[PDB]
Amino acid sequence: MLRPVETPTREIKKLDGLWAFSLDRENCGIDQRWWESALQESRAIAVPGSFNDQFADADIRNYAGNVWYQREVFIPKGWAGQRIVLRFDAVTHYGKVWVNNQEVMEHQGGYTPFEADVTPYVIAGKSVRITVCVNNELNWQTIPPGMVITDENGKKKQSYFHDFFNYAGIHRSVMLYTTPNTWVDDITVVTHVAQASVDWQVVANGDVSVELRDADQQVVATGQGTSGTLQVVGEGYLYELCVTAKSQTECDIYPLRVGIRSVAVKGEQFLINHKPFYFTGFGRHEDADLRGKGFDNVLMVHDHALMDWIGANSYRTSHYPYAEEMLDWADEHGIVVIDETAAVGFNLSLGIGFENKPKELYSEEAVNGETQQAHLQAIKELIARDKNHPSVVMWSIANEPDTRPQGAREYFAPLAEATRKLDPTRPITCVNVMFCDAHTDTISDLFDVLCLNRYYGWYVQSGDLETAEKVLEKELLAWQEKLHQPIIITEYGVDTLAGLHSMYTDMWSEEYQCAWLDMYHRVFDRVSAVVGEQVWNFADFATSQGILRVGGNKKGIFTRDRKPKSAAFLLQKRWTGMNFGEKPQQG
Amino acid sequence: GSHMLRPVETPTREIKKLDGLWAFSLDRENCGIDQRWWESALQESRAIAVPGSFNDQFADADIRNYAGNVWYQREVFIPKGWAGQRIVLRFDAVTHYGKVWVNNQEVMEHQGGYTPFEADVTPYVIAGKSVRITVCVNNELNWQTIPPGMVITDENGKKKQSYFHDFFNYAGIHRSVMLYTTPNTWVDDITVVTHVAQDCNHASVDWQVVANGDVSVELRDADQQVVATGQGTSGTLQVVNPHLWQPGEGYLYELCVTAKSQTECDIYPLRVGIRSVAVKGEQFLINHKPFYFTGFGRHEDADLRGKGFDNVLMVHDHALMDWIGANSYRTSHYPYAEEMLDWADEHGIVVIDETAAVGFNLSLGIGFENKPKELYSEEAVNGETQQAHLQAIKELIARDKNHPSVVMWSIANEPDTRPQGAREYFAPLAEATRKLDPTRPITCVNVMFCDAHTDTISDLFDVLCLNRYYGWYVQSGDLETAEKVLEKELLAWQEKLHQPIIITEYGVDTLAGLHSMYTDMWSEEYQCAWLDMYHRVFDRVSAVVGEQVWNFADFATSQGILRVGGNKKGIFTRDRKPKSAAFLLQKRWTGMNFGEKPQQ
Ligand SMILES: CCC[C@@H]1NC[C@@H](O)[C@H](O)[C@H]1C(=O)O
Ligand SMILES: CCC[C@@H]1NC[C@@H](O)[C@H](O)[C@H]1C(=O)O
């Protein structure tokens, strides 16, 4: 499965915004089969957006259970001789959908599309009732995991183990799509460099021809057959190889953009086209002021303008798969992307407070075999749909897992190996949490380049930069000599509320963010193996409520409404001072 | 105005073209028209989101303050199952000036920044292939624009736009772009008007221009059960025993007009609410019952889209207004996105509909630095200006005529009526508006300094709308003098005109977080105290039938020593968080009985 693009392939975008929405507090929907009649006592909701914060209501915001969307649609008239298929680009956590009293789809996965042919349940020209049942619950076999808890009164409350807030709803595009009656499924392409080759595979209903055209889209070379190899002689050139499906009586044309993408890892260097690289940029989040994680074109354009100004050339889709629009953008603009799945919270050592969670991390009570297989499904879907993007430069299996407990490597080994089985073109990482240090972590052996999320001077060095530097440097050198891999610091940052200034350079002040980030920068400058720096969050984002979070995680370089803290000008001076992709040497 | 109805979905349809990502480029030296950029793909472009203002999408002050022409562009595949159908391309709002090319054929031109414009473009496309849409957008204001302004060119030829309204002059394609298909039998326009007597029964006269054929109509129920039927291009009266459109509820029948040609059919559903507005003495009646307006002057303004319409923003802002107890609002200083008038229609929100005629006043800006000396004059507000204004009223009424939520038209906001020729200007505009729609009252929002003994034009309008700021811009910080001045000025207006009085703006700048024990200006405590005193005075004047505090949220403005990052008069911050006064109003507005004036 890959993204619908239009040519003699058509669609009616159904991000019509306003659907009928209703909560299901007493779980009556399935039994009264609500999809059967117009929702009783509904309210208007926006459909590219989370349902949590759109109504300024704490009881919808913290709601756990089943919610219901509904929307009627007229199917276009020129589709009577076509297959009508219905695609949701992201339903966060779980979705099941009924096209007029007949059930059509079901899917467990919050950041990946799922589609299904409904041509035998539609006829072009008339109006059908679409009803969606969305679930936002997490158990130990979900990606990410969690524990629902039902109190004395029967009220559900969801507990989880990741920082960001558990936003849910229809966060991305809904889509009615038609394609000619022979070509259905997937295409895959792989690219090589010689210090200039390709490959093709199409799955459709008949003969296939493929022609690579360039940005002027004049044909630069053509083959036809499911496989073989053509050759050819800040932001990146994207050719376009146009694959055609000659068969039955109708032809089908699909355009797939390809970039000359190359890379594996070599010793201590993350090369690109046989070129050393330094990652600069951010751990991101899909989080905005009123839409939750809902995608929005304005926000995307503005935050790319911000990363462009600040000099970042890369980022990482922190803790879940992102809106594909962003990877198409990264394609055209030459942004380097670390693709991560929703597998966060595999750790019960991070929660901090005054408050019964399972005692053995890897076991049947928690992360079991079912968990490992749901995980492998998540990696499967992320690779299945982002495989042809040039901007995806590395896969990341999970984020900050607890690898101290027994059973950790028995769990993660088949996943690393299987993912290498899923695509050998790009490297494999697993971002490492602070407390599984160099002397302790179990799984770093299995990955190509190890990524570190370290916060010396914040969570563990009590605001004392002068010792934090020393600790961070030992640990740096230790990691490299233990694995002689490239080191990408994927998370590093401190909570700072915009407006707090202090002569004493204290924690939470803007001066402290500046000083802390630049001391980290000084040690980066001095160790061979660090090939990347991505600060911990570009903007402030929302989290669940707790004594550690003042209205959200304030570790951002920008505020939630995208206004710059002082450190935004620190980074801008450093990241645009170096030349592109090259690390500042030691002074 | 020219015939136009909202594109609604029947067995003939529309395909959304706000795909957001278009090619955008500014035209710094007007090379665009000369090289007719409309001919080839835009040279040196960057991605823009549509709909949204272009000013703040790139976090760059040099685009933000840019004056001149900008260029949007996008290819489109026209669906082929549309062959033998009329294809129309509608822009719902291109702010200030826009003209567009279907690759090389130019199709439309428009100077109104907040009202739609379309053109039948069936002979310039054929279904199945993809054509390039190129749009030229101008953000310049002169004295014949609505609103007016003065572009001024420095020594170097760079433009800088000067204007005389508070809010910032956002531009771009702010609303929906859209290709839509209709059968070759045209239902070009519909007009519906409602009457009632004692809530028991009456009728909805009707008129329709349907360019191509016979028309029958059926008014259907919320159950879509037929409750009456008509026949004819006009007349089309039927009588009912209905459940009529009321503020708290908003019951909407559906007028299904069908246009039978000899081979083609066309179906249009137009939602109607059975409401009757009028004014009698000092009372604003709705279904023959006095009404009390509560709520806000609003704005189309958010943190990164400028004035771009956004569904989440609409849903969340209605959630807040509903919580806070607001029952009404007015589309402050320009026509709003029709989505909002449909929302108000379905939910029973009462709306004062206003045109973009702000800044007809050179007495409001205050500072230390060349504006014309005669407001009404050939160099400034001129005859061309008056026809431009009459055109703006023509489009707004043409587009929001059948909405039950629209309860009153407002021609302009805070014009200076002191100079002679103010009444010469506004009188024919008031009379013309009255003939363009006799169903709803006519207002013209009154500025603080054209007081009751000074104003010239209020004679000409049905309901008096006051923007008062005693205690803020004058009597600054003194609640005891502001109360007296306000109360005698209110009583004065009542003695002079015996109209209903709606206080359509009253508010103070309040920094969220700034608290004070001394109840001084800019603190949240001052907002509460100030609004609260104003509320005692309203409660003590017979003729005041409405209160709309000045601004629901903080919004952006031009830069100046009076605007701290914008106008801070909102009850909510720009990111919709409530100041302390937000709970003051919530206590009042849900304490009173719905639609009733507090009895003191
Ligand atoms: C010491 C663990 C740090 C933690 N790392 C994972 C991110 O998802 C969180 O945002 C970050 C944080 O605490 O902000
Ligand atoms: C005395 C004029 C007040 C003025 N009235 C018009 C609004 O558009 C402005 O926002 C408001 C203000 O200055 O706050």
Numbering used by the authors:
A (entry chain B): 1 to 195, 200 to 237, 245 to 366, 369 to 600
B (entry chain A): -2 to 366, 369 to 599
Report text from the authors:
However, intestinal bacterial GUSs cleave the attached glucuronic acid for use as a carbon source, allowing potentially toxic compounds to re-enter the enterohepatic circulation. However, microflora-encoding β-glucuronidases (GUSs) are notorious for reversing the glucuronidation to release SN-38 in the intestinal lumen and thus represent the major cause of undesirable effects. GUS contains a deep enzyme active site (the two catalytic glutamates lie ~12 Å below the protein surface). To understand the underlying structural basis, we prepared C6-propyl, -hexyl, and -nonyl UIFGs (2–4, respectively) and resolved the eight X-ray crystal structures of 1–4 bound to EcGUS or Bifidobacterium dentium GUS (BdGUS).
Isothermal titration calorimetry was used to measure the thermodynamics of the binding of 1 or 2 to EcGUS and BdGUS. At pH 8.0, the endocyclic amine of inhibitor 2 (pKa = 9.4) was mostly protonated, which afforded a stronger electrostatic interaction with catalytic residues than did 1 (pKa = 8.0). In addition to a small negative enthalpy change (about –2 to –4 kcal mol−1), binding was contributed mainly by entropy (+4.6 kcal mol−1 for BdGUS in Tris buffer; +7.1 and +5.0 kcal mol−1 for EcGUS in Tris and phosphate buffer, respectively). With the aforementioned structural information, the differences between the thermodynamic parameters for 1 and 2 support the idea that the lack of H-bonded water molecules for 2 diminished the coordinated H-bond network, which disfavored binding and thus the observed enthalpy penalty (ΔΔH1–2 = +8.5 kcal mol−1 for BdGUS in Tris buffer; +6.2 and +5.5 kcal mol−1 for EcGUS in Tris and phosphate buffer, respectively). Furthermore, the expulsion of water molecules also correlated with the entropy increase (i.e., –TΔΔS1–2 = −6.2 kcal mol−1 for BdGUS in Tris buffer; –5.6 and –4.6 kcal mol−1 for EcGUS in Tris and phosphate buffer, respectively). Therefore, introduction of an alkyl substituent to C6 of UIFG produced entropy-driven binding. Furthermore, EcGUS contains a narrower aglycone-binding site than LgGUS and BdGUS. The alkyl substituent of the inhibitors therefore facilitated an increase in hydrophobic contacts with nonpolar residues of loops 3 and 5 in EcGUS, e.g., such as Leu361, Phe365 in loop 3, and Val446, Met447, and Phe448 in loop 5.
